[PDB]
Write a protein that binds this ligand. Structure first.
Ligand code: MN
Ligand code: MN
Ligand code: MN
Lengths: 515, 517, 516
């Protein structure tokens, strides 16, 4: 309300709308030609497997010398090893050029990405820690040709573009500590550099949205950001806000967000490609502020996970942006379920969902699943088309971590074929997933209610936690949808010790490529 | 706001602004000259050590007789013993006169006050149980000459001036159970009686502010009480509140109190004496309503500690008033960080606050709020005033770790300069309101507040790594670059109260600290 | 016990009794005289402050070149920076030599060691991670002359000598991953190299004992280790074991350990120097197996802290050994309160008669371990051949210590201000830092009030000077004979870190004895 906050929020909105990636892409041939073998600064990174690092092609690189060769021998698997090379020509005018070698493991299980982009991110991050001059450009020489997962991994790595440190609050929370990164592949990339920049930009925007604190990224500012991109890229944006949600039957999202300073919003984006689209897909994202809870973990654990509660909404939004920027051949909708949930209040309330089914709120902490029900029905009932696939993404349960872990998002899906496709998309993109038990027969009884059609939380916590939360959402699917529904629980993969990971967008982009 | 509720608050403000102590001070010589051996009432109290009680000077007192002599023999250490004296001359017209003997211990460690005023408070408190009438003055004969600690101890004791019992709410919450007390020192006091009364008044005013419930002492009423004394005693008052705090850049104090019904207020009082001041001191005080929390103790424990959450702001305010009344030669500022932490645990969790100092704070725990408001207060004091202080003293009921660390009777001291530490520690032993130092080592405190997106968090990552010190360190990071003096952080979470309520801890310590500057 | 266990336990006892340090000490001049610019191996380490690293004497060092100079510019404060130097002379004949520069901060508060040996340990540990061969000698050039704290800091660093990894359990749990280290000071050390090695040996022996799991370092094996050192170094050992503790009135230590498989033991060691001792100091150490608890922290936290329960007994024991090896002029006794706490309801509300004659109600069975220190403190002050001037008890006692003083500073509860200042000086000089906790017996006594016994074993209110109250309980069992200074050291947290035991205690005791 005050002028100081009003201007701060407008500046933040602009920064997200105007975000440009720090990562550019090229190949070894074009690099030598365009840059004349001159390194961009006094720091370079060489990343690859034990076999790749010993390839003859490595010896022909500009920075290569006997000191680098010894680094390739001395470096550990999953570790880095730095050496100084004196008298090397570089644009920073540095006396020495630091070459940090990083070894990527070949070991990869059937449920992981063979390129191991998880380690690639870790390796470059460790190499960038030596940087004291952040305004420099850093050449990152990768020996793998898996352009998509590597593009995401490098965008993921290093200092985050969101920062409030050292006066960055005055600069619209744009970090000054980030280095420009030039990823140099061995061959010309199968996906154009401009397309890879789009993927890397979305990963970092998603990261920015999830990193941002709830006083900056609000329901209002998210909507303003989405409307900003609609004006720039030319896609349709529909907004159902405040009491219009109640008046038009959206009781779930209205109930969850009615008590907030900012009104709840159901923000639907629409993209339609030129000519015949290969599929019609609807995305639904959970974007509830100050909303994280459950029974599987302790209350203190959920307050930690609450930091990344926009992960679902951010994921689908940036995946949508990539589809428009790459002009992918998919008719796409993206519904953002936005609301501020600001313990006893609303407890035992019976709300009338948009689907017409009634829900008893036995636990007010589990409101995220409720807004997804309205979003799912909206996508499958109220749009100008009926989607072939529905993909809901959300940071839903603590059980997800216990079930599938920190690196694999849980998939709850009705059709096997769609599950397999999404699993392949995770392994190809590096944003990996794993299936969670699909068995509606055993999920329905857990939501039994004396007075309403269903409760909003399973009676017994130890009966397939991730699955049951997924099942709840499926009960609010419109009857005119009879396709594949993919529920993605990404409570944990959305973050690590350094903050947001931008998990989701690249998985969607890779999924749409193989449709 | 309802009329009856608005009328109640105005009456409470007036009771605080116009408060007067029930204690008066004199000596035996002047007492025999003024009262002629006629006791003030039918209850007399004799407090002193085992040795002091057996001194020849004791029998020369007007109330002494063979019964009182036997009382001295039968009394136990730290206990009381009462005897009647039939037909002993007194002004109250009582047939008997009760004489209570209290034995003070001589045992006192190098960290404690030698006079043991903690027991003097307890002995007199027990003695006043046998009071007959509500309008009488009880003569308290102290055998010690430690005037300042005995003054604060006696002001501390007995029934509290704040009360809502037996219809006292209709009398602006002024208790009718508080007996008048006349402290009779052996020799004329080193501090003048008029000055000792100002100290006892500040102790009991501090007690009233802390005892008062949050529906009576609010951010608005504290400010109105501050503004009242400013007009009465003639000192300046600056008040930044509401959206002005946000617009001027005080994001910490603003974020904490923005949800409440009454706006958050940064209330600075300025006192500048006549001539050259011996020192320039800035005082900062935590006064957050409904705000108490941490990780060291259980949630149920912090709700008990919440009761006395104004202790920091009250101690800093009352010490300021004593300096103005005694006209101490110290240029003094006093910033009260006032806000109501109103409305859930999830609200404002993971928010990033742009503090007045320019440094950003990630709020990982919304229960640790006053620690943040002190950061804005400390910067204000060291950056925005017309002068730059030589010493900054912040006082607050901050951490549960203080109780585990230094205990119920000693406030934790976190201070950068050994010299300033020793002075405050000496002040604590001299005043009776004791302190003990907490580890100072910024090297090991800084890493506990590591944040991914902000310059710091508001709470330490590991609770078992010098929790009193870390809370103090956070505050120091928001000190101005202009400031290069001694910072004294006083954590008084526990010493501010006992089983009977507020203790009025702080003001006397500050006054005794100012005296030796 | 089975033959396989007895064999393993005997092998472990021998490894501790015959432990030799991996660290040796010298100076830049002697280094040049002995090996004339030939590095000991393909790894060299340079550790100093921002100012020290830019001293002109650093350019003249054997490993220096333009790359090393660039490392000094690019290294971060508190961090390390490695560079390869091609064709540098080294005994290994390696084609390249890795030179790792580490910057030490000058920042240090009045309660910390000015040399910041905590960072030195971290820097050298990080450097040794890039070691090629595990056995080779690594030259560690330190630009500081504070020899004692640097000695303990380097002993502290790197891979620990105790290990059960990769078949080490077949070699008596001696690690094969530890590198030899040559510390090279700028000037000849003020303390002799051989004396510095003894300090380094005690730090690492202490580290070994604390790192050791409770199925290897038992009450029996600790005694056997002590008896082994008694025969080798030539000092007297007294062992009161089992029912003899009960028969001779040691009800505290007996009650705590009576239920175990191995009996409880009060092991007292005695060292007397030749001539006139400067002081008569008695050491008491808590060495209770499977014993850690309190009210300040959660039950899960005390299980984590239970790993380092021998820290007190180990620190006192290894400090004694250093006094015997260096032949320090202090008459020393060392009482190890050893017991295995088996097997929560058992012994709850028991009233025990302590050796002091005072009775203790056991209101909390988890806090049985302050009790064993009570019997030990009385023994040292009443039952010995001499009456000590100072009694120093050491124990990993309370979770409140971490809350009060932190991870790097041990809590000091002591009656006399002079003895406190001395121990604080010892901590700042040695690097094994301490900080005082509130001393005020007036306010501590009421917390242990009991209806039936003289006292309880635990404070009634946890939020009333937790570390101090634990100390006060111990002081009540001091002998009437004793009128000296009592120093209670609560080292619950400083005894360990993320990598395991730190060997905190011995170097603190050594530096304390040196300035008496
Ligand atoms: Mn991880
Ligand atoms: Mn008390
Ligand atoms: Mn640590």
């Amino acid at each position: 309300l005050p002028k100081a906050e009003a201007k701060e929020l407008s500046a933040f909105v602009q920064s997200c709308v105007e975000y440009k990636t720090n990562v550019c892409f090229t190949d070894v041939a074009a690099y030598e030609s365009n840059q004349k073998g001159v390194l961009s600064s006094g720091l370079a990174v060489l990343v690859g497997t034990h076999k790749q690092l010993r390839d003859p092609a490595v010896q022909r690189l500009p920075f290569y010398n006997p000191a680098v060769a010894e680094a390739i021998e001395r470096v550990k698997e999953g570790g880095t090893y730095g050496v100084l090379v004196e008298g090397l020509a570089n644009a920073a005018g540095s006396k020495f050029v630091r070459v940090v070698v990083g070894e990527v493991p070949t070991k990869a299980s059937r449920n992981n990405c063979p390129a191991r982009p998880d380690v690639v991110t870790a390796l470059v991050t460790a190499a960038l820690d030596e940087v004291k001059e952040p305004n420099t450009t850093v050449d990152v020489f990768v020996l793998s040709n898996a352009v998509l997962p590597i593009a995401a991994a490098v965008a993921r790595c290093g200092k985050h573009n969101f920062s409030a440190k050292d006066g960055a609050a005055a600069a619209a929370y744009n970090s000054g500590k980030v280095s420009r990164l030039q990823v140099v592949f061995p061959e010309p990339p199968a996906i154009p550099p401009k397309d890879l920049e789009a993927v890397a930009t979305s990963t970092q925007l998603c990261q920015r949205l999830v990193d941002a604190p709830p006083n900056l990224l609000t329901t209002a500012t998210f909507t303003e950001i989405a409307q900003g991109y609609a004006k720039a890229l030319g896609f349709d944006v529909d907004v159902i806000c405040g009491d219009d949600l109640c008046e038009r039957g959206y009781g779930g999202i209205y109930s969850v967000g009615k008590a907030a300073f900012e009104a709840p919003r159901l923000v639907t984006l629409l993209y339609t490609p030129k000519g015949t689209p290969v599929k019609k897909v609807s995305l639904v994202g959970k974007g509830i502020v100050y909303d994280c809870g459950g029974l599987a973990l302790k209350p203190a654990d959920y307050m930690k996970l609450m930091k990344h509660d926009m992960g679902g909404a951010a994921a689908v939004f940036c995946g949508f942006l990539t589809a428009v920027r790459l002009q992918q051949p998919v008719q796409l909708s993206c519904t953002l379920c936005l609301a501020e949930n600001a313990k006893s209040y609303r407890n035992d309330d019976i709300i009338v969902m948009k689907s017409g089914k009634t829900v008893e709120v036995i636990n007010t902490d589990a409101e995220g699943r409720i807004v997804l029900g309205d979003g799912v029905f909206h996508a499958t009932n109220e749009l100008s088309f009926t989607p072939d696939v529905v993909i809901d993404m959300a940071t839903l349960t603590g059980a997800q971590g216990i079930a599938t872990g920190r690196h694999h998002a849980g998939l709850y899906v009705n059709e096997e074929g769609a599950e397999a496709a999404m699993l392949r998309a995770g392994r190809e993109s590096g944003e990996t997933c794993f299936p969670v038990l699909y068995c509606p027969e055993y999920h329905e009884p857990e939501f039994k209610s004396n007075h309403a059609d269903m409760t909003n939380l399973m009676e017994r916590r130890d009966n397939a936690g991730v699955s049951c939360a997924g099942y709840f959402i499926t009960t609010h699917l419109s009857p005119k949808f009879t396709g594949a529904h993919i529920h993605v629980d990404l409570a944990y993969p959305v973050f690590n010790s350094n903050g947001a990971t931008g998990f989701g967008p690249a998985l969607l982009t890779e999924y749409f490529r193989k449709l």
